[PDB]
């Protein structure tokens, strides 16, 4: 975006529509990072579902 001459929040190219939302939540505005850095991997994240 030109407004900050950098990345910004942008349209959800994820879904067309979302009918009948049975559940919703937010909690944290959690801060996983975005910058185009080119060093080695410094952050390991692991999840189980």
């Amino acid at each position: 975006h030109k407004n900050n001459k950098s990345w910004m929040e942008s349209e959800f190219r994820v879904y067309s529509s979302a009918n009948n939302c049975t559940f919703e939540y937010v909690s944290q505005p959690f801060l996983m990072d975005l910058e185009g850095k080119q060093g080695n991997f410094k952050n390991l994240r692991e999840f189980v579902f």
């Binding site: 049975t22 559940f23 919703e24 939540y25």
Partner: protein, 48 residues
């Protein structure tokens, strides 16, 4: 919100809000003096 909302609907096009994942303290409703009508069917306020 619902019991203080600034716009209630026209009855032919009634609003619905869905209540989920929360503590329903119905006491703030059932012993309010404000309501002209209050009654429940299949459930008593002494239990909900």
């Amino acid at each position: 919100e619902v019991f203080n909302a600034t716009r209630f609907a026209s009855v032919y096009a009634w609003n619905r809000k869905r209540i989920s994942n929360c503590v329903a303290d119905y006491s703030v409703l059932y012993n309010s003096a404000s309501f002209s009508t209050f009654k429940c069917y299949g459930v008593s306020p002494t239990k909900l």
